[PDB]
Amino acid sequence: SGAIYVGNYRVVNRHLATHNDWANLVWEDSSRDLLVSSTTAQGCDTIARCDCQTGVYYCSSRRKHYPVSFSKPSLIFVEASEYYPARYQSHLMLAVGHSEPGDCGGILRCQHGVVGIVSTGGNGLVGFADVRDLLWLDE
Ligand SMILES: N#Cc1cccc(CC(=O)N2CCC[C@H](C(N)=O)C2)n1
Numbered sequence: 001s002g003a004i005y006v007g008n009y010r011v012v013n014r015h016l017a018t019h020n021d022w023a024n025l026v027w028e029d030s031s032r033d034l035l036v037s038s039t040t041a042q043g044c045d046t047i048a049r050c051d052c053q054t055g056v057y058y059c060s061s062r063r064k065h066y067p068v069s070f071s072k073p074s075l076i077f078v079e080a081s082e083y084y085p086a087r088y089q090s091h092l093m094l095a096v097g098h099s100e101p102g103d104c105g106g107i108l109r110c111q112h113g114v115v116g117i118v119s120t121g122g123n124g125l126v127g128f129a130d131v132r133d134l135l136w137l138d139e
């Protein structure tokens, strides 16, 4: 679990969005596993606007942060799950690092701010949904 809180927006994994997220929907994209909802309170986070390919992510299944080198956002095949049919997930970045079911929502940050959130993983990989191209989150 986990979310990004920036301005009057809450960014979550689309497959973990709550009834309240859907009732306050701003934007969602199944191909990216992202959903953004509106908030009444001002958020605590700021978004990176950069091309960093290294950073640190929070891994809830270890209660620890780990450093990672990750690939540039791209279209990657993701096997079927209870949440989605087998499909290509766009704007996804992969890295070697521990993740297991439950780690989705953990934040990836570089020196510039929030880069994205955990969205996939397994077998010593961890995949992050990029948010750096969503410029409207800043206004
Ligand atoms: N974190 C993590 C992790 C590690 C091992 C396994 C998993 C589960 C996983 O990959 N998916 C299930 C939920 C929806 C996902 C998607 N974006 O399509 C795919 N996550």
Ligand SMILES: [Zn+2]
Binding pocket: 048, 049, 050, 051, 052, 110, 111, 112, 113
């Ligand atoms: Zn950066």
